[PDB]
Amino acid sequence: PRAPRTYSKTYSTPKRPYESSRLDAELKLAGEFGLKNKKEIYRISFQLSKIRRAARDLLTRDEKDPKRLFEGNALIRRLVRVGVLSEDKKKLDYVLALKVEDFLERRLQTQVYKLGLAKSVHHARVLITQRHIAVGKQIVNIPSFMVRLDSEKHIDFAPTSPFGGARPGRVARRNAARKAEASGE
Amino acid sequence: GLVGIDQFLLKTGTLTTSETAHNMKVMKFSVSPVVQVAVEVKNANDLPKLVEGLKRLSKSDPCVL
Amino acid sequence: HGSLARAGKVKSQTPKVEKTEKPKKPKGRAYKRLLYTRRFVNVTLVNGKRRMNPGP
Amino acid sequence: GKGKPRGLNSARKLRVHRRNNRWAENNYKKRLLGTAFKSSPFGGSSHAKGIVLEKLGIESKQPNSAIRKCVRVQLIKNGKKVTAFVPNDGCLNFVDENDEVLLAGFGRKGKAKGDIPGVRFKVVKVSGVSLLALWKEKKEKPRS
Amino acid sequence: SDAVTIRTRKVISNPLLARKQFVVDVLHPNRANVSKDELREKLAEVYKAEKDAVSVFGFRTQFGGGKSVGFGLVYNSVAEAKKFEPTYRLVRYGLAEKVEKASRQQRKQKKNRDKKIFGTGKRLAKKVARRNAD
RNA sequence: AGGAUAGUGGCCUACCAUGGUUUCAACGGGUAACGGGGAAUAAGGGUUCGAUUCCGGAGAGGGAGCCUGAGAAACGGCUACCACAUCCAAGGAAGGCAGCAGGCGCGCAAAUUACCCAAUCCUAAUUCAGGGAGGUAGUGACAAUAAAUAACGAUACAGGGCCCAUUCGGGUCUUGUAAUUGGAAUGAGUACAAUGUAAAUACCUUAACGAGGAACAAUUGGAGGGCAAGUCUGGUGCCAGCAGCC
Ligand SMILES: [Mg+2]
Ligand SMILES: [Mg+2]
Ligand SMILES: [Mg+2]
Ligand SMILES: [Mg+2]
Ligand SMILES: [Mg+2]
Ligand SMILES: [Mg+2]
Ligand SMILES: [Mg+2]
Ligand SMILES: [Mg+2]
Ligand SMILES: [Mg+2]
Ligand SMILES: [Mg+2]
Ligand SMILES: [Mg+2]
Ligand SMILES: [Mg+2]
Ligand SMILES: [Mg+2]
Ligand SMILES: [Mg+2]
Ligand SMILES: [Mg+2]
Ligand SMILES: [Mg+2]
Ligand SMILES: [Mg+2]
Ligand SMILES: [Mg+2]
Ligand SMILES: [Mg+2]
Ligand SMILES: [Mg+2]
Ligand SMILES: [Mg+2]
Ligand SMILES: [Mg+2]
Ligand SMILES: [Mg+2]
Ligand SMILES: [Mg+2]
Ligand SMILES: [Mg+2]
Ligand SMILES: [Mg+2]
């Protein structure tokens, strides 16, 4: 038989189920970033934990351990490449500090609202979803996307669809058809 | 004959592919399940094989109740 | 003895009451918008402490 | 000195004494002796079909008073005869004689839920259909 | 043909198969993907070997429209194509005609029936003729 | 010492000797035991598993035997016994799915009697032929990834920042409640075509059709404690039932 596909779980569920402290702190993050599930939160805190997992494990190695420097750069190279690590904080173990919020900020869904463009984070999500708004030649509709900050000024409404010229939209299209039917002929 | 249908049939039926085709007439026949007897298994462990069997026998014939 | 006799007793006795047609509750992201709003800004149900059910 | 040896060469006595003393652990002992095979009305499986021999009523333990409404089942794989609680209001009326039922355990690893003496199983399906789905008039017992 | 702009990346000459191989990369805004017989001549003129001798396949159109990506070949001649080319795609191009056959299961049955005859099989064709029914 | 083997060897035979293993656990019993790479849970240490994508090994109903051949103690080879079992004109003949589908049985427990060598590779006298290996599709809430079920105005209201203030507020930012209405966005479907593929199917591209809420309508568990969330109303009255535990 041919080889197995590998697959992995992206998320991890909390241990105490009914601590209101976590229940409320979660819901604040939902309305703020326009999320639906706690899975959306859990995925990110699991990512963040899968990341401190590597981070504390490198500070235990003494400075100038070729592995420490090599993946220490590799990490932060990937973390201000997205804007979830600020440019100054490129220093080594500022990483251990991040909360989840820095990721939800760098989500595609949030930028489309924090770049004007949406008027509400809930409006942002459905704008992404419905084949509007794109980066270059590429049309993107995954609210959790991690804009790379090489792109937060390279994203306008897509070349297709209204809000972007280049064709008129389809609800006004039927609405304006009978604009020339109850007008006599 | 059709295979793989039996498990959905008690004794008879109509097969259609219309959304609203009706059933089919009920085959008025002449004899009737009138002479009865009583059964149970010689060995008690066998009752499950008997209750299953009685459903299986009732498919065998068009008349046995 | 002491038969079943009365199995469905209360369920068979509890008078039927009907559900009512309601405003449909939104599903998905839009619902946690409601929990956000209905718990953080224009929640027209608070009562001094933070309480989630009135016996008016 | 704390009861056990410490020497770098006392691995044998250390390992062999855990082996000895693991036996006072019920969960270990039930596994190694395989009493879910030798004992245990189900084969050590989670469920079991069965032919309902008769309805049956059991008075609860005190302080409570009520009739709990069990059935008596002969397990198809086993012959073994057991009793099983039938959940929820009424709902005994869904059980006829000698229609197959699927029984589950009682969420208690043997033992028994509070009221009911000597009952370690619950009906889950009867005549092939889910019990709850009959309680809620959402599914029908199969046609005669 | 809305600004069809039929690009062609990663090319190299292959005498061992008597053809030149390359990937195609077509843009087509407002133009919802572009056909193959269509694509075959829009470059059959580019290196104008015969139109009946240029071959292309692959072609997953990209997301949000406006692109597609294939893989193509140009043969030195038509006859060097038919010969070296996959027999199955010569017929979409049209230069070959499909071969009707018998169903794979049905020809397998005949194989196993002929395992039961040893000779020509026309020896027993006559022994049955005489008898039955005497 | 010979015999035998492809060849070492108590592998076997003749002769001789009395040796060989064991509490540092032999021998025996059990395994719901094929080993391993590995899987689950993991502060660290550990605990539990591994029939199952690779590797090694064993088997082809149970045993033995054997022909062929470089290679088999072969099972889609033969011979015999044992168990099961088919056909028949009763003289006789033939059998091996732990291969692919499919069925019985068994059970809590597991899919199509479908298409094809196009890819992956394999074989042969062989570029060509064969390949239920393998690939495709069917079935599939085993597990895993992403993530629609609405967005946004206005009407009125409860109001909530507010520049003037002898001012009921003379401007207001904001927030939502009530069928109060409004035009925008859209894929789920469906569907030109192309694309896809060996030929199709779905996907991706996309012509036309596809949203007002009575629909394009999300469920599953629960609201005494553990434990997030009612001292609401009606019903029943140690009955029915709930209740992991209290
Ligand atoms: Mg579009
Ligand atoms: Mg002990
Ligand atoms: Mg013991
Ligand atoms: Mg003791
Ligand atoms: Mg059942
Ligand atoms: Mg020798
Ligand atoms: Mg075994
Ligand atoms: Mg093992
Ligand atoms: Mg396990
Ligand atoms: Mg294994
Ligand atoms: Mg096994
Ligand atoms: Mg398999
Ligand atoms: Mg193997
Ligand atoms: Mg073998
Ligand atoms: Mg067998
Ligand atoms: Mg053999
Ligand atoms: Mg073989
Ligand atoms: Mg075979
Ligand atoms: Mg299953
Ligand atoms: Mg089955
Ligand atoms: Mg092939
Ligand atoms: Mg071939
Ligand atoms: Mg498949
Ligand atoms: Mg799933
Ligand atoms: Mg309840
Ligand atoms: Mg509470």
Side-chain angles (χ1 to χ4, degrees):
Chain A
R2 92 104 184 282
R5 263 317 244 289
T6 81
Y7 61 71
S8 279
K9 265 188 64 179
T10 61
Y11 69 107
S12 75
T13 61
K15 286 199 165 146
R16 292 176 190 279
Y18 306 118
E19 44 186 1
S20 316
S21 92
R22 185 190 36 81
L23 280 173
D24 291 10
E26 279 171 17
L27 201 43
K28 208 282 184 182
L29 260 92
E32 157 149 10
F33 297 100
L35 318 158
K36 25 178 302 203
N37 328 6
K38 314 310 184 87
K39 219 163 179 295
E40 257 147 21
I41 302 163
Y42 300 153
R43 178 179 48 192
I44 287 294
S45 10
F46 178 65
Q47 282 184 23
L48 198 165
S49 290
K50 198 163 149 59
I51 283 176
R52 312 192 321 262
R53 201 137 214 74
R56 50 202 144 182
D57 238 318
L58 286 179
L59 291 227
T60 54
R61 293 154 173 81
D62 221 305
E63 294 134 284
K64 173 34 80 176
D65 178 11
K67 199 194 179 188
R68 176 173 170 177
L69 91 96
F70 181 78
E71 318 187 352
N73 282 67
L75 230 62
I76 325 164
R77 202 283 285 164
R78 298 196 317 266
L79 289 170
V80 202
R81 205 205 172 172
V82 271
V84 71
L85 194 38
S86 280
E87 280 274 2
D88 169 281
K89 317 286 182 194
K90 193 228 172 211
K91 328 176 208 315
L92 206 57
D93 61 292
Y94 284 112
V95 276
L96 290 180
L98 288 340
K99 198 179 170 175
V100 292
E101 290 112 1
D102 311 340
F103 295 81
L104 299 326
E105 272 294 320
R106 299 304 298 150
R107 287 178 110 247
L108 188 274
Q109 199 218 195
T110 312
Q111 300 295 281
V112 181
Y113 165 74
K114 278 199 80 270
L115 307 181
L117 241 278
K119 102 172 292 177
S120 101
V121 82
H122 306 81
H123 181 74
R125 198 167 220 265
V126 40
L127 263 181
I128 315 149
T129 252
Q130 279 171 322
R131 320 234 329 145
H132 308 331
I133 105 175
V135 308
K137 64 276 107 191
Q138 193 54 259
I139 300 81
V140 148
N141 70 334
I142 310 311
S144 62
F145 174 91
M146 302 308 172
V147 303
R148 269 173 175 169
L149 128 167
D150 307 18
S151 332
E152 57 172 323
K153 313 94 177 188
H154 212 146
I155 49 161
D156 201 69
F157 302 71
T160 165
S161 92
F163 324 97
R167 295 211 290 119
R170 331 303 317 126
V171 132
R173 220 294 218 92
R174 57 146 153 95
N175 250 8
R178 64 273 295 242
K179 238 67 170 307
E181 187 64 292
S183 71
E185 302 181 15
Chain B
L2 297 312
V3 307
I5 303 315
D6 21 286
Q7 68 254 52
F8 310 101
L9 289 173
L10 293 187
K11 264 175 184 302
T12 170
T14 340
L15 311 151
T16 87
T17 46
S18 173
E19 16 271 68
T20 170
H22 284 50
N23 242 284
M24 217 105 161
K25 193 196 108 212
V26 305
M27 276 192 50
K28 168 220 77 186
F29 26 47
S30 338
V31 306
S32 197
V34 296
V35 34
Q36 341 177 64
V37 294
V39 191
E40 13 60 87
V41 259
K42 216 160 285 164
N43 26 354
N45 261 24
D46 288 3
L47 167 75
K49 309 201 264 304
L50 177 66
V51 306
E52 177 67 28
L54 282 151
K55 289 159 163 180
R56 258 112 155 279
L57 164 63
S58 151
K59 292 184 180 172
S60 128
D61 238 79
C63 48
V64 50
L65 213 43
Chain C
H1 207 96
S3 333
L4 96 77
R6 34 177 203 270
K9 220 214 90 158
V10 178
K11 188 176 171 68
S12 63
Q13 281 183 338
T14 61
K16 193 83 184 72
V17 186
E18 287 308 328
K19 17 272 280 68
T20 352
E21 277 278 273
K22 305 156 198 173
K24 154 202 176 201
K25 281 317 147 296
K27 296 138 184 173
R29 173 218 69 251
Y31 189 89
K32 303 288 184 217
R33 183 190 216 190
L34 191 268
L35 296 206
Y36 198 74
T37 65
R38 212 177 55 176
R39 296 164 178 252
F40 296 136
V41 44
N42 200 277
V43 39
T44 322
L45 185 143
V46 172
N47 185 268
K49 292 68 55 195
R50 48 167 198 164
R51 262 197 45 181
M52 313 208 179
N53 236 74
Chain D
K2 209 163 153 177
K4 43 175 155 195
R6 293 239 184 71
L8 240 233
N9 289 351
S10 53
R12 172 159 269 113
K13 171 170 266 118
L14 293 200
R15 67 192 292 218
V16 58
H17 281 8
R18 265 294 79 74
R19 265 197 292 136
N20 281 326
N21 284 254
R22 285 213 87 180
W23 288 106
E25 280 167 71
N26 292 19
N27 265 60
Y28 184 89
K29 203 166 199 172
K30 271 80 196 70
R31 176 160 73 246
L32 244 288
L33 313 183
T35 21
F37 253 53
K38 294 139 152 279
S39 325
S40 175
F42 295 10
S45 64
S46 49
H47 302 69
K49 274 197 187 84
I51 295 301
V52 177
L53 298 182
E54 42 150 351
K55 296 182 173 190
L56 169 50
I58 305 193
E59 257 256 43
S60 44
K61 290 166 162 285
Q62 80 176 10
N64 303 2
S65 320
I67 302 326
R68 287 278 166 243
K69 280 83 197 191
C70 307
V71 305
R72 263 264 299 290
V73 203
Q74 177 186 336
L75 290 180
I76 270 172
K77 62 147 144 291
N78 230 338
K80 284 180 178 161
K81 290 162 202 196
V82 311
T83 65
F85 180 75
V86 307
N88 307 339
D89 209 331
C91 212
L92 176 57
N93 307 136
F94 292 120
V95 192
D96 279 318
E97 219 181 325
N98 303 9
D99 36 350
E100 301 191 39
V101 293
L102 190 66
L103 317 190
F106 234 158
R108 205 83 148 73
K109 341 286 200 158
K111 298 327 144 212
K113 260 189 64 132
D115 259 3
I116 310 91
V119 163
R120 336 211 270 192
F121 308 106
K122 56 200 237 191
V123 182
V124 138
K125 285 162 80 182
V126 46
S127 262
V129 314
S130 159
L131 220 199
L132 148 143
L134 296 164
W135 203 52
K136 318 302 211 171
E137 13 252 9
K138 248 47 63 191
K139 285 273 303 152
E140 106 278 340
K141 212 108 155 319
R143 67 281 182 265
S144 175
Chain E
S1 179
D2 196 354
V4 258
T5 328
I6 310 94
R7 323 164 47 66
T8 151
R9 303 233 76 181
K10 280 177 178 298
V11 326
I12 195 69
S13 304
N14 179 22
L16 294 160
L17 292 179
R19 50 101 166 286
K20 282 72 209 155
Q21 320 167 188
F22 58 98
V23 9
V24 349
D25 173 298
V26 27
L27 323 322
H28 44 63
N30 174 69
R31 178 76 181 87
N33 107 116
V34 69
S35 133
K36 281 241 295 309
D37 142 85
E38 174 170 346
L39 270 209
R40 277 178 62 243
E41 41 198 9
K42 227 295 191 175
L43 31 59
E45 67 184 17
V46 164
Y47 347 56
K48 185 240 158 289
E50 281 281 276
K51 191 261 180 165
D52 303 285
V54 18
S55 172
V56 85
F57 47 78
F59 293 121
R60 270 197 61 71
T61 120
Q62 209 263 115
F63 196 50
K67 193 171 298 164
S68 303
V69 173
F71 185 102
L73 323 150
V74 54
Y75 273 83
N76 299 349
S77 60
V78 226
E80 288 165 44
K82 291 199 195 188
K83 197 275 201 80
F84 286 67
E85 264 284 303
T87 170
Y88 79 84
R89 62 159 73 108
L90 293 187
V91 68
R92 349 161 118 192
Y93 299 159
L95 277 308
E97 65 183 343
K98 36 264 196 168
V99 41
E100 85 286 73
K101 211 186 309 165
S103 179
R104 153 167 271 264
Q105 211 163 11
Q106 306 174 16
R107 35 188 198 78
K108 276 173 173 181
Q109 317 206 327
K110 198 204 182 295
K111 182 259 285 198
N112 292 328
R113 250 170 311 163
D114 304 340
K115 275 161 78 195
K116 292 185 197 141
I117 46 95
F118 180 67
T120 196
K122 289 72 186 171
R123 312 225 302 170
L124 59 91
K126 255 314 160 203
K127 195 64 179 306
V128 308
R130 169 62 167 172
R131 311 308 164 181
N132 166 64
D134 294 296

